[PDB]
């Protein structure tokens, strides 16, 4: 009996400046109710980096979890592509 | 807690009861967990319809029916299977 | 209710006979025997719609709901509406030959009782499904009106079969619209209720 699977995203780090955390812009992007054209929206999430293995400009995946603090609900899975 | 119970449907003078697994907390016509088929009282003949396997599934997880729903189970014969399950 | 007056206004024999238009073919009233003017598009739609609903005596609530139920079927729309008003039970009684009008066939269903498949039907707007043997109970078994309408001989339509003594009216497949009505122009009434 394998337990239920949590929600997963991928995104992009805006800032490193918070202590042991980052914020992450997920750029999934969707169309209207009326005009039908498909527009973009950037959703930045607060996510915990317990190893601090992040950089500004880093494409990263995040998993949802238990609420880590106020506004924090996410953690790292696999830091995919690093900034230059 | 969990009770297999009739659920009132129908017009004013002509009632109707869906045999419906709900809680004692929830209102009579209100929210409910799942359903098995039906119960026509007001027919001059018969016509009870019981699902006969998912009702049995709810009886064993723990859901004790009211008296008329229980004796409908006895009339269709699901209580004999339930007593055979207790004899199992 | 004159109901001859409806026929001479609509300009159609609503029984379908040499009566009720002879000696007075104009509409009614003090502006009638003079040459009345022809009607517009709206007037033509009113003419065909009121030809049909004064044939069958329907209020426009029931007439619209039967229009809608004919819409709930498949095929051609105005044909199916003709089919629903030729499945109406007053029309079934008047086409079995049990009345001289459609008011008399309404009164057979209202009090001078007539029976479908058993117990009774007191209601004229009963849509009659096929296969249904329609007769009378042993109380009104043969009284003066059914005796008169047996003596008078109308044609039985090909969507019916009718017996004299046993008096059961049975059905066939469907009433085809070649048989139903020659005078009423359908699909002006569909256009009238399209608005």
């Amino acid at each position: 009996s394998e337990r239920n699977q949590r929600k997963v995203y991928q995104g992009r780090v805006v800032s490193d400046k918070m202590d042991k955390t980052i914020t992450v812009v997920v750029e999934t992007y969707k169309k209207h109710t009326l005009y039908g054209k498909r527009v973009k929206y950037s959703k930045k999430f607060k996510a915990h980096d317990e190893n601090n293995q992040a950089k500004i400009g880093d494409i990263v995946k995040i998993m949802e979890t238990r609420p880590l603090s106020a506004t924090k609900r996410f953690r790292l899975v696999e830091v995919v592509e690093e900034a230059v | 807690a969990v009770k297999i119970r009739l659920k009132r449907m129908g017009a004013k003078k002509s009632p109707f009861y869906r045999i419906v697994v709900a809680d004692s907390r929830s209102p009579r016509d209100g929210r409910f967990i799942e359903t098995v088929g039906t119960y026509n009282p007001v027919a001059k003949p018969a016509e009870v319809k019981i699902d006969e396997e998912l009702a049995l599934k709810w009886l064993q997880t723990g859901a004790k029916p009211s008296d008329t729903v229980r004796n409908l189970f006895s009339s269709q014969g699901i209580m004999e299977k339930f007593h055979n399950a207790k004899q199992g | 209710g004159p109901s001859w007056k409806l026929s001479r206004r609509l300009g159609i024999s609503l029984s379908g006979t040499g009566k009720e238009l002879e000696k007075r073919p104009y509409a009614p009233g003090p502006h009638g025997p003079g040459q009345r003017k022809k009607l517009s598009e709206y007037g033509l739609q009113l003419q065909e719609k009121q030809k049909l609903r004064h044939m069958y005596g329907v209020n426009e609530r029931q007439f619209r709901t039967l229009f809608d139920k004919a819409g709930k079927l498949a095929g051609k729309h105005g044909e199916n509406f003709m089919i629903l008003l030729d499945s109406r039970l007053d029309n079934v009684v008047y086409k079995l030959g049990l009345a001289r009008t459609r008011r008399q066939a309404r009164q057979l269903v209202n009090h001078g009782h007539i029976l479908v498949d058993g117990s009774r039907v007191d209601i004229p707007s009963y849509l009659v499904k096929p296969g249904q043997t329609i007769g009378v109970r042993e109380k009104s078994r043969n009284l003066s009106i059914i005796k008169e309408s047996v003596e008078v001989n109308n044609f039985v339509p090909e969507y019916l079969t009718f017996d004299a003594e046993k008096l059961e009216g049975t059905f066939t497949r469907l009433p085809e619209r070649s048989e139903l009505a020659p005078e009423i122009n359908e699909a002006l009434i569909v256009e009238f209720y399209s608005r």
């Binding site: 005009y35 039908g36 054209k37 498909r38 | - | -």
Partner: protein
């Protein structure tokens, strides 16, 4: 600039219709080649030919005027513009002039026609009405 070349080839065919020209050079991307192959196989065109060259290549179209002076193609239209793309599901694929026209619809298995996408029961970009 040029902002989409498919709409421009459709107007180029339309202007060759309205002038009643007989040949057309179109700068021939691969989807243009597949569109003209569809319009060939549906009889809107006599024949279509490719001129593979250095700049981008040329596709030439031979407009079909079957009788006295009769434009078989009356009008063209582009549905998915670059700025409102249009995508239809398979139970929404439009059949046009109900059967007498057609819609070029490039799904995941080939740039298809109306009947081809209907029989394959898939949808994708909806990129031309052809009347």
């Amino acid at each position: 600039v040029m902002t989409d070349p498919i709409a421009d080839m459709l107007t180029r065919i339309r202007n060759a219709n309205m002038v009643r020209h007989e040949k057309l050079e179109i700068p021939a991307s691969k989807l243009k080649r597949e569109i003209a192959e569809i319009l060939k196989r549906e009889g809107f065109i006599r024949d279509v030919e490719f001129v593979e060259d250095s700049k981008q290549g040329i596709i030439r179209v031979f407009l079909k005027y079957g009788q006295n002076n009769e434009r078989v193609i009356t009008g063209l239209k582009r549905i998915s513009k670059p700025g409102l793309r249009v995508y239809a599901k398979s139970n929404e694929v439009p059949r046009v002039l109900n059967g007498l026209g057609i819609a070029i619809i490039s799904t995941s298995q080939g740039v298809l026609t109306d009947k081809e996408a209907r029989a394959k029961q898939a949808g994708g970009e909806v990129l031309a009405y052809v009347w």
